[PDB]
Design a protein around this ligand. Structure first.
Ligand SMILES: COc1ccc(C2=N[C@@H](c3cccc(Cl)c3)[C@@H](c3ccc(Cl)cc3)N2C(=O)N2CCNC(=O)C2)c(OC(C)C)c1
Length: 89
């Protein structure tokens, strides 16, 4: 397969809910479909769209945690490091 990620059926479903084709592409493409997933699913605080709260969502099940932010994106890179060697923060 390609030198990037791809999911299984129940995880492909999550990026399909954001109009994608699973995680079946590079870091920059997954984070694009994930940004629009959070924007549709509206899993954020009213006073701060920057802070994400995934309580009981398939995205919280996918990442293994029910919160992250656009200032602390390390939960994405912990998802990616398991597939390919890449950057983190
Ligand atoms: C003050 O609150 C904000 C501020 C900014 C965004 C933001 N910033 C990007 C981004 C680019 C590069 C790196 C990062 Cl870490 C974030 C990207 C996004 C991509 C991936 C993820 Cl996982 C989440 C969000 N992102 C974004 O999708 N939007 C969509 C709406 N309009 C925009 O201009 C920004 C925002 O997004 C919500 C969806 C959380 C809300």
């Amino acid at each position: 397969q390609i030198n990037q990620v791809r999911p299984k059926l129940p995880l492909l479903k999550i990026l399909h809910a954001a109009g994608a084709q699973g995680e079946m592409f590079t870091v920059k493409e997954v984070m694009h479909y994930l940004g629009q997933y959070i924007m549709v699913k509206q899993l954020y605080d009213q006073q701060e769209q920057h802070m994400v709260y995934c309580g009981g969502d398939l995205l919280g099940e996918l990442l293994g945690r029910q919160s992250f932010s656009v200032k602390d994106p390390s939960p994405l890179y912990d998802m990616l490091r398991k597939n390919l060697v890449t950057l983190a923060t």
